[PDB]
Every structure is written in C-alpha cells, then in structure tokens.
Amino acid sequence: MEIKRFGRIREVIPLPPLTEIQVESYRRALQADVPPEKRENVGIQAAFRETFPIEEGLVLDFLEYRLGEPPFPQDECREKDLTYQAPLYARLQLIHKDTGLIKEDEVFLGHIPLMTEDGSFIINGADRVIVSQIHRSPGVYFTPDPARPGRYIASIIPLPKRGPWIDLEVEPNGVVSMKVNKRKFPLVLLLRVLGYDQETLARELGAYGELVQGLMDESVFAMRPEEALIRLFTLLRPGDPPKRDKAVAYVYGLIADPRRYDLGEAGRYKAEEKLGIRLSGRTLARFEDGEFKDEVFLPTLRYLFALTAGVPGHEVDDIDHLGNRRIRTVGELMTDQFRVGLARLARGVRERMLMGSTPAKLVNSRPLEAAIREFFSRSQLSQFKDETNPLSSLRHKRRISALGPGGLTRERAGFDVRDVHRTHYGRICPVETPEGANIGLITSLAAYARVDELGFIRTPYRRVVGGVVTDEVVYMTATEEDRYTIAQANTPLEGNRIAAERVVARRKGEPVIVSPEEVEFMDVSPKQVFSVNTNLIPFLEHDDANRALMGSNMQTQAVPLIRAQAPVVMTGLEERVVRDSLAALYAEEDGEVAKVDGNRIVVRYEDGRLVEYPLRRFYRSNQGTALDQRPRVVVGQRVRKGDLLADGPASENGFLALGQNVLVAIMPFDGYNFEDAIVISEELLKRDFYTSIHIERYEIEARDTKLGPERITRDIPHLSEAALRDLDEEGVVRIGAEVKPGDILVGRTSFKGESEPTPEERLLRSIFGEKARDVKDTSLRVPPGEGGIVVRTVRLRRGDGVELKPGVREVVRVYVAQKRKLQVGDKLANRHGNKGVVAKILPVEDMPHLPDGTPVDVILNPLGVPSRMNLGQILETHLGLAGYFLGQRYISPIFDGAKEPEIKELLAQAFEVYFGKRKGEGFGVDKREVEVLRRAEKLGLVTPGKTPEEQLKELFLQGKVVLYDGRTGEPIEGPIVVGQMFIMKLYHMVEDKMHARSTGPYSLITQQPLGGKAQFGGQRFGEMEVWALEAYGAAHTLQEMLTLKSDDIEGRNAAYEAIIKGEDVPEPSVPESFRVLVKELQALALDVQTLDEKDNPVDIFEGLASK
Amino acid sequence: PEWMILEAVPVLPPDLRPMVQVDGGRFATSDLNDLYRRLINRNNRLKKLLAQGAPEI
DNA sequence: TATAATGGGAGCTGTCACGGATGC
DNA sequence: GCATCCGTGAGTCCAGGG
Ligand SMILES: [Mg+2]
Ligand SMILES: [Mg+2]
C-alpha cells in the first residue's frame, strides 16, 4: 500500500553501522586478520608485550601469536552447549643467557571466544553480550576542595588497575602534600628523588607568590637523590628494610614501570593538553641512566599553584563532562582480563624456571584459560543476551553501564553521575534509562554517536561557511564541540543557505539566538539526540519525557507475533533497524530467484554462481520467543542488490513489526479499563492477532550411581499404558505429541537407597504378596502450568564424537512449543508509554461499533492521558483513522513530522470515503446520529445550522465519530475518538507468572519453604507483611505464618493430617529456625536459655541435645 | 571475665553446616567446614610442635 | 634422605552518618 | 575538652538466575 511521508529535513548521512561499537572494538583487540609482523602494540598483542620477556639465568621471550579456526560452528555450539571460540597459539623462545642456547616452539594457550557477526558471543551454548562500561578518563584533574573554599585538589588518575590514584593538596600549614595508597607525605621529598634542586624549583615556581615557600624544606635539599629515595621508601614501607635496590624497584614500579603504571593513550593525551607539555610514554617518571627523570609532577604542581593563585587560563575540571568520561568497549575489557591471566601464567613460568633442570614445559595455560572464562561467564558486563525480539539484541549491544569492575556501586551513586549532562547531547540518549535504582547508571548510545579510538563519544556536525551549509560532516568530542556555535537542524534553508535572520544555536550547551554569519556548524538531524528505541516513537515532540522513557523501554519487550505488522504511523527508521540487527535476509548482488522453500532460497547471481540461503525455522531464542525466517520472494523474481529475500521475527516486508495495528476507541467501559486495565475484542483471538510462538527446553541426565545406574527407559514401575502412551521405544516422548502438566517427557528409573521397610510396609507387602521393585520412577514430567507440542528431541549418550562430564551416561533434551493466544492478564503497550493488562475479552456483539457495523478492537480509557501528558498517542490515533479509510501508512519523522493541518486534510479525504459510501448506498443520517449531533452542538464541537453531514464532518476532522453501544443499539452520548493505533504485546505473560503451593520442598538448614516457581516455592511473608498482621491484631493468623506454615516441622505435618481428616489444626510449637539460631549462638560461645517464670530452664530440644 | 577467652571452641551440629550431594551426585558444603578445618589443622600442628620443643619463634 | 640452596607479594579508588578514638 | 580522624554498617517489594 501507499506510504506518504512528512517533513522537510533531508539527512546528509545515514546512521552508522549500529553495532560497530561491538564489532570494531573486538576486531581491534584480536587483530586476527593482520599478518603478525604488521600488528600494532594494542589488544592482546599489547598484553603479550607487557608480560614477556619473563626473566630470572633463563629467559622466555614472545615472538608472535596466532588464532586458528573455530573447532565448531555457531549453531553446533548452541546445540551442544559449547563456547564458540578459536585456539590461541604463541611462538616463544627460551634463551639461556650464558650458554647462548635457544629453544623455540609454538605453544597452545587455550581458546578465545569469537564474536559472531551481529556482535554477540556464544558462551556455553547461551548468547551473551559484553556491555560497554563508562568511567572517568585517566588524566590530570583539578577540583575544588569541598572543605577549604580557596584551595584545590590535583588528581592524577591512570587506567583502572594500572597504578594508584595520586592526589596533591596545599595543606593548611602551607606544605604541599602528596597522597598515594592513603599516605600523606610532603611532595618535596619526591621532587628531590626526581633530581630537582631548590634552584630549579625557585626559578620554575616562584612566580605564584608565597605558595612556593610551603615547598622549600632545607632538610630535604640537604640530601642527595639516594638519601631522599631511601627516606621515601621508609615512610612508604614501615618495617621494610630500606635496601637501595629495593627502594629503586619499589618507586620505579610505583611511578615509572610501564608494566605497572599506565595513563593509557587517553590519559596521555588529556594530561598533555591540560598541562601543556609533552610525554615520552605513559608514566609519571622515567628511569634514565641510573636515575629518575620527571615527566608529569612538576607540570601538575605548576598548574595547581597557578590555579590556586588565580592566574588566567587555569580552571577546575567538570568530571561529568563527556570530555572526561570515556567508554571501555568489549575489546578493552577483554584485553584487561587477558592481561591478568597472562600475568598469572608468567608467575607460573618464573616458578618453574626456579624448580627444574622447554617453552611448553615452562608454560601452563590454565590460569589464562581460567581468567577469560571468568570474564565471559561471571562478570557484571557479561550479560545474558536479550533477544526477545531483534530490536532487543540491537539495543543491548549499544548499552553503557557505569557499574561493573572498576566502576560505581549503586545505593551510593549520587545525583551527579545519574544526571543528563549538557554534553550528552548527540552522544547518550536522554530518555532511555531504567526506572528502578539503576536510573541514570545504564544508558544507550545515541543513534549517530560513535566511540572514537581513545574511547570518547563523538557526534556529527555539518560545516557552515558564511551561511552556507556544506556536506562536510565532522565527528566531535564534547571538548571540541565546546569551541563552536552550532545551529539547530530545523534551521530554514533555501538550498544550502540559511534562510533566516535569527538562528537558534548552542554555545557550550547554552541556547542562543545568533546571526547566520556566526554559525559554524549545524546538527545533522533531530535523530542524533536519541537512542534507537526513542527514535521509533512517532510524534515524540508531543510526549512528556517520563512516558517516552516507558515507550522506549517497552519496545524492547515486545513479543514477535505470527501475524506481526509494521506500524501505520512509522518514524522512518523501521527498515534500518531490521537491517542492522540481521532480522532479515537480503540479496547479496543483483540476480534471479531459482528456488524458494519454507526451508531455503536459491538465488542465481550475475556472476552465474548459485548461492543457497538456508532459513532458520522455529528456533528457540534466549527468551523462548521464536526465531524463524519466512521467504518473501518467488521463483523467477528479479532481485537487485539489497532487496529483501526473507522476513525474520518482527519483520513485515523488511519493516520492524513489533505488534499489531488495531482499531481503538478512547472511552471508559463499565470499570473494565479502570486504572490502566484494557478491554479487547474476541475478534482479535479469532484472527490470531497477538498470537505468539514460544519454545521451552527441558533436560534430564542419567548418571552412574554407587547404587547402580540410572536408565532412560520406557519400563517404568507401576505406570499404566495410558501414562506411557506417547513414550517411544527408548522412553522418550515422540515428536508431535501433546503434553500437559503431569505427562512424562522422558522416562527414567533410579535404584533405591538401601532402606529397611517400615513394619507397616512389611505387612502390606505380605497382604498383597508383591515384591517391592528395586528401582523407582524418577522421570522428567511436564511441570504445572506448562505443556504444548513436542517438536525436537536431542539424545547424547556416552560411548557414541560425544563425551559428557564424569559419571553421566546420557543427556536427553526435549523441546516443546506452544502457540500463545492473548488472554486475560497479558500486558499490552504502545510506543508512547501507555501500558496495561488485559482485564476483559468481550464478544464482538458487546463491542462499541461504527454506524456501518464495524466493531472496534480495543477500548482504552481517557483517564490515562491528562496526568501522563503523552499526546503523541492521540495524534497517532487521529492519523490512524485517516489511514484506515485511505488504505495508507505514514512516515512522520520525530520533530519533523505530520502537523495538525495535514492530518486534517487527510481526515477530510477519509471522511469523503467513509460517508460518501453511505450517501451512495441509499441511506441518510440516522436518528441516533441526530441525537449525538444535538449533544455535540451543546458541547461546542459543531457549528449550529450546518447540515447533519457538515457537522459529522467537523467531528471527523476532530478525529471523532458517532459510536453505538453493542449491548443496546443506543449511541454513546458524545462522539468518541476512534482510530488505528500500534499496540504491542509484551513479554510479561500471566501464563508464566501464575503460581500456587499447598506444601512442597523445604530448605536444608532453615526447614523453610523454598523460593521459586521451578522449586514449587512458597511466597515470602516478609518483615512488612508481619507488621501488617500485627497492626490488625491478627495474632493466630501470624502465628500460623511463622510456625505451621513454614518451619514448625511437627506443626506442619500435624496440620496437613488434621485437614485431610477434617479436624482443626493443632496448636503450633517452636519453629526450627529458632532452634537453628540457638545452636548458631552456642557456636559463638553464648549460652541462650529459654526460662519459665520461676527462672528454671525449659528444654526446647526435648532432651535430644542433653547428655 | 576470663570466659571472654576461649579454651574449648564449640562446634556447630553438622546438619547446620551440611555436606550434601546435589542432583548429579556432586557435593556442596558450607564455608564453616573449611573455617573449622583450618582451625583444627593449626591446633593439631601446634600440639605436635609443642611436643618436639620447637624454638619459640 | 646429603653439591648448595637463608626475609613475600598486592594493591585499586565517584557514599554517609555516627559512635568511639586519637592528637591539639 | 575540644575539637579532628577513624572504623563500621546501611540502603522498598517481587521475580529468576545465564
Ligand atoms: Mg527497570
Ligand atoms: Mg534490576
């Protein structure tokens, strides 16, 4: 159908590759495509260069590394719970210094996980994303002392875990202290160790008045560098022998050892720019020709004194400016764990260099392998990939965390780090962030933003030269952005000339009205201010930010539907999102389609080559939503490069399809849409709208026991033929069977634990004369509330290219699919932050309906709009009404979209279609329509004196219609807003959440019910629930909660028995967790005694613990 | 007052610091067992070192 | 069971109010 | 005694866990 698009801003550049922050970062770290001799000293190469050589004699040196091919492809890794990875080899050579002997070998170091095409990892079968971290950049900072108003703290900050934080301060007594590892000593001492004389310090610092006097200490200048160095080593290491070579080694490792101190390239560049100096390397001092040489300390002190005095060109630093906060991407995070593993490996090497009589013999790879594994599994930036829908994955790869190793601790993060700083503009989305306690600490990269080689976020601007806007675009950091006057992207242009006398611009974030002459740059697009998710909200300019945040976040949670549709009002970013997230197959070059299947597409390209594309069909995502690709071409069709070959999940002809377009009425409805509840039509179920496919995975193991082996079998003791009906010969449920709660998926038997039968059992056996069998039923059954159709079984048994962990003989996995129809308690939402649970599904004859008999689909309450202030959803609905009757869709770009007049034109055309149809078919205006027009006239909505048709048209241009109540045939007494709205079904389905328990498993130590639906758990009756019962005086209810219902063992047994006998519950006794508390206090050497009123002990342990 | 110094250290009953085989036969145990084992090894080595009259250091 | 071997490594960073403990 | 310099324990609810 026809797509009409609005707006006058033409985007000079498209969005960059939206996952490049992942892909390019990791490619940089591995340098796998680069011939070894051409590699830069970065990434894992730089890790190797820091570790090696390994000395002390023997020497083990690094030549080069190599990455081989992955032993298993990606799908096989998902299927067999493998890690997708490449073997790492290193060429090393051992030289004995005195012999001259040289032994060389390529040693195998383990495996390194590989990034897949879309930017994610496959760690032990599960997809994972390494989330980028934001931190304070290394460098040299100057900050107000929060105590002393006219004094300043200087802070030297290296890369994380690459040196200590050093602070310089001007003490109230006037001496300039240095703090490192929490040790306040006079800086003069270190200056002396560096080789500075009072002459050089006088001539270099005296300009700043009396400050330099607090630096002059004669007892220090009276000592040569060696005596000062030993003095520092004493006041830094109390009790350590002040050995000369040990003091040199310590201070060198603290200030000058590049293998231990590292400002990084960013900290280097910023320290140089700030202090106006040049650095040889990346450390604070060097060791040259037997002595220490200063690099940073004197320039830092120079600046600190100049700032304290007041001399111009010296300012304090804004630590939240995005020129001072940088992004650690996956490549850097991984390289750091690699560097730690390599350091442990080198310690093992030196260890074996002492004890021994080859490179391989010297190298134990295990620590390295351990560190990488530890990074990729148990890190806080290593996250289970969200692939609910394909936008979810794309968005996940662009997230930014201020938490993680080397970052902030929540519950402590103040208001400053969580703020949106002025410099976030075009760099970090200002709306998309969590609503809980993590608010402001997790964020999203802006659509046009790019992380530069140093890790600062850059945004693009177009160059303006004398009022002419060029096509030169320049990516800037926030420091560079601050130099210029930058115009807003909606500045009116005639061709390339700014066609306005007054121009809205920014100077250092500050809004300012400016002449064209003064304009230096101009924004590329409103799009650059917001995340990808926020860029998908039409009419964003009419939505309060708080609800825009919710619409942003909830697009992530949309379930892919079997009949998904793209929105009738789009922003124009839907195709690019489908493309960048690999949610579709596209033609590689021009060609012709040779074969088309549910399973595969074969295309003949211009080269004559015949390329085959297998289609992924009903695959299970990390979240159980269905990944399947559907072909969208036919045999013989001519395709150009980039044309769509197949739709993935949430894709409709290559457009992002996160839900359905439904016909909506905005009106109250009998309490059923009270407080954000939502009423829907049964029609939606009838035509499988909001139907989704979900796939669950169940797993069972058969292991060797000391009591005999577990067996996966059909021969299960005491089960009928009905219970085994759908079990295969080997005891595994067959493909296509319908399984319900209780049904067996995998039969399994286990040998019984050695037990003498209770005398009652002995007698019951004699009465029936039946030998108790030797194995018991331990089968895998469908848990409560689950089930569906069996669609796959995998069977890995030992003795078969298959080897499992020690003692397991076989693993069986069963895949079960369900088609989930929308039901009461499921969550729906729109892109403007309107969200609600379905409270009522009405039959079609109860639905409000148009005069032509068309019922609406969903009924949203008007009380949800005024206090939420998200009017974009109203405009969307108005335009949806137009589109409904014109058979068209719209692209309305954010801040550059459809305006009310154009929507009114379209509603006039749509009215002609909606009403002239009637006037032709031989009908006039209804009596009920006349009653509603009478009311509308009193409401001020229609002009008195016009004809029925003209007034109906006025209403229609306000987006309102006469609506009939399906229960009565009488009209709603005012005209109602009706139109098409895009609504998604979110991944919060009551099918997954409903859970109840009578009794069930209890905890080992506390004897309290376990938690969790999978453990058949109980609900927590926490401290505050207890307070509520206390405040009602509900003493017995509360005593039940604390005893008979939790960890009163005899109480719970006796209450179950009394109920099944129809008696009343007995009186509770002591909870077990109080017994546990008494025993744990006895272990602390405390005697805790329950007494009676006569102060005589009472034994709560019933003699069982007294000798 | 002297009861604030320990001579006999109490040992918690073993079901409050269990050693349990989970599904799969693999074993899980409380940290307290390792803290006790450290204490017991150090005490036993002290009793032996006293028996051999080891130097004061 | 015997050549001789004699003092270790790791740090690590954006909170806050409050009770008690050290310097003036 | 009078301030300063320290340690220390604390931060809503649920869910699942990869
Ligand atoms: Mg949240
Ligand atoms: Mg959370």
PDB file of N, CA and C in Angstrom, chain A residues 531-559:
ATOM      1  N   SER A 531      18.389   7.658  21.437  1.00  0.00           N
ATOM      2  CA  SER A 531      18.656   6.249  21.217  1.00  0.00           C
ATOM      3  C   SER A 531      17.854   5.728  20.029  1.00  0.00           C
ATOM      4  N   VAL A 532      18.205   4.522  19.583  1.00  0.00           N
ATOM      5  CA  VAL A 532      17.404   3.878  18.540  1.00  0.00           C
ATOM      6  C   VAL A 532      15.962   3.642  19.006  1.00  0.00           C
ATOM      7  N   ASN A 533      15.761   3.165  20.230  1.00  0.00           N
ATOM      8  CA  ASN A 533      14.384   2.890  20.624  1.00  0.00           C
ATOM      9  C   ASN A 533      13.562   4.168  20.660  1.00  0.00           C
ATOM     10  N   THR A 534      14.123   5.243  21.216  1.00  0.00           N
ATOM     11  CA  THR A 534      13.396   6.502  21.298  1.00  0.00           C
ATOM     12  C   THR A 534      13.100   7.078  19.911  1.00  0.00           C
ATOM     13  N   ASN A 535      13.984   6.836  18.919  1.00  0.00           N
ATOM     14  CA  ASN A 535      13.788   7.246  17.526  1.00  0.00           C
ATOM     15  C   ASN A 535      12.675   6.495  16.811  1.00  0.00           C
ATOM     16  N   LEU A 536      11.995   5.569  17.478  1.00  0.00           N
ATOM     17  CA  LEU A 536      10.918   4.795  16.882  1.00  0.00           C
ATOM     18  C   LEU A 536       9.551   5.237  17.392  1.00  0.00           C
ATOM     19  N   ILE A 537       9.492   6.328  18.149  1.00  0.00           N
ATOM     20  CA  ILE A 537       8.248   6.835  18.721  1.00  0.00           C
ATOM     21  C   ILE A 537       7.763   7.989  17.842  1.00  0.00           C
ATOM     22  N   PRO A 538       6.715   7.806  17.048  1.00  0.00           N
ATOM     23  CA  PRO A 538       6.210   8.929  16.256  1.00  0.00           C
ATOM     24  C   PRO A 538       5.608   9.976  17.168  1.00  0.00           C
ATOM     25  N   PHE A 539       5.707  11.235  16.742  1.00  0.00           N
ATOM     26  CA  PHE A 539       5.152  12.362  17.497  1.00  0.00           C
ATOM     27  C   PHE A 539       5.795  12.489  18.865  1.00  0.00           C
ATOM     28  N   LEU A 540       7.064  12.085  18.957  1.00  0.00           N
ATOM     29  CA  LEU A 540       7.805  12.197  20.203  1.00  0.00           C
ATOM     30  C   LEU A 540       7.747  13.617  20.770  1.00  0.00           C
ATOM     31  N   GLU A 541       7.689  14.645  19.899  1.00  0.00           N
ATOM     32  CA  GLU A 541       7.637  16.033  20.361  1.00  0.00           C
ATOM     33  C   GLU A 541       6.382  16.348  21.164  1.00  0.00           C
ATOM     34  N   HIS A 542       5.371  15.481  21.157  1.00  0.00           N
ATOM     35  CA  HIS A 542       4.166  15.719  21.947  1.00  0.00           C
ATOM     36  C   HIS A 542       4.072  14.852  23.201  1.00  0.00           C
ATOM     37  N   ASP A 543       5.135  14.137  23.581  1.00  0.00           N
ATOM     38  CA  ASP A 543       5.101  13.185  24.688  1.00  0.00           C
ATOM     39  C   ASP A 543       6.033  13.673  25.783  1.00  0.00           C
ATOM     40  N   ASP A 544       5.500  13.859  26.993  1.00  0.00           N
ATOM     41  CA  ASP A 544       6.337  14.103  28.162  1.00  0.00           C
ATOM     42  C   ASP A 544       7.430  13.040  28.266  1.00  0.00           C
ATOM     43  N   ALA A 545       8.637  13.464  28.666  1.00  0.00           N
ATOM     44  CA  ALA A 545       9.789  12.565  28.624  1.00  0.00           C
ATOM     45  C   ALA A 545       9.599  11.324  29.498  1.00  0.00           C
ATOM     46  N   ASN A 546       8.865  11.430  30.609  1.00  0.00           N
ATOM     47  CA  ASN A 546       8.721  10.312  31.541  1.00  0.00           C
ATOM     48  C   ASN A 546       8.009   9.118  30.914  1.00  0.00           C
ATOM     49  N   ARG A 547       7.027   9.368  30.063  1.00  0.00           N
ATOM     50  CA  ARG A 547       6.302   8.308  29.383  1.00  0.00           C
ATOM     51  C   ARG A 547       6.983   7.894  28.092  1.00  0.00           C
ATOM     52  N   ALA A 548       7.662   8.838  27.431  1.00  0.00           N
ATOM     53  CA  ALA A 548       8.526   8.474  26.315  1.00  0.00           C
ATOM     54  C   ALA A 548       9.569   7.466  26.762  1.00  0.00           C
ATOM     55  N   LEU A 549      10.099   7.640  27.982  1.00  0.00           N
ATOM     56  CA  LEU A 549      11.039   6.666  28.522  1.00  0.00           C
ATOM     57  C   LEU A 549      10.400   5.281  28.570  1.00  0.00           C
ATOM     58  N   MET A 550       9.134   5.199  29.004  1.00  0.00           N
ATOM     59  CA  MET A 550       8.496   3.895  29.095  1.00  0.00           C
ATOM     60  C   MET A 550       8.257   3.304  27.720  1.00  0.00           C
ATOM     61  N   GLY A 551       7.853   4.124  26.755  1.00  0.00           N
ATOM     62  CA  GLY A 551       7.635   3.606  25.412  1.00  0.00           C
ATOM     63  C   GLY A 551       8.916   3.105  24.776  1.00  0.00           C
ATOM     64  N   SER A 552       9.986   3.890  24.911  1.00  0.00           N
ATOM     65  CA  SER A 552      11.325   3.421  24.601  1.00  0.00           C
ATOM     66  C   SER A 552      11.571   2.044  25.181  1.00  0.00           C
ATOM     67  N   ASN A 553      11.504   1.928  26.508  1.00  0.00           N
ATOM     68  CA  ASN A 553      11.937   0.696  27.160  1.00  0.00           C
ATOM     69  C   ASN A 553      11.039  -0.475  26.796  1.00  0.00           C
ATOM     70  N   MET A 554       9.752  -0.227  26.550  1.00  0.00           N
ATOM     71  CA  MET A 554       8.875  -1.369  26.348  1.00  0.00           C
ATOM     72  C   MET A 554       8.930  -1.904  24.930  1.00  0.00           C
ATOM     73  N   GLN A 555       9.411  -1.113  23.970  1.00  0.00           N
ATOM     74  CA  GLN A 555       9.634  -1.738  22.675  1.00  0.00           C
ATOM     75  C   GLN A 555      10.585  -2.922  22.786  1.00  0.00           C
ATOM     76  N   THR A 556      11.533  -2.870  23.723  1.00  0.00           N
ATOM     77  CA  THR A 556      12.462  -3.979  23.941  1.00  0.00           C
ATOM     78  C   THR A 556      11.741  -5.281  24.272  1.00  0.00           C
ATOM     79  N   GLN A 557      10.590  -5.195  24.927  1.00  0.00           N
ATOM     80  CA  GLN A 557       9.907  -6.347  25.493  1.00  0.00           C
ATOM     81  C   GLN A 557       8.784  -6.877  24.606  1.00  0.00           C
ATOM     82  N   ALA A 558       8.556  -6.277  23.434  1.00  0.00           N
ATOM     83  CA  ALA A 558       7.539  -6.758  22.507  1.00  0.00           C
ATOM     84  C   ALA A 558       7.833  -8.175  22.042  1.00  0.00           C
ATOM     85  N   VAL A 559       6.804  -9.008  22.046  1.00  0.00           N
ATOM     86  CA  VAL A 559       6.914 -10.400  21.610  1.00  0.00           C
ATOM     87  C   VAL A 559       6.741 -10.470  20.095  1.00  0.00           C
TER      88      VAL A 559
END
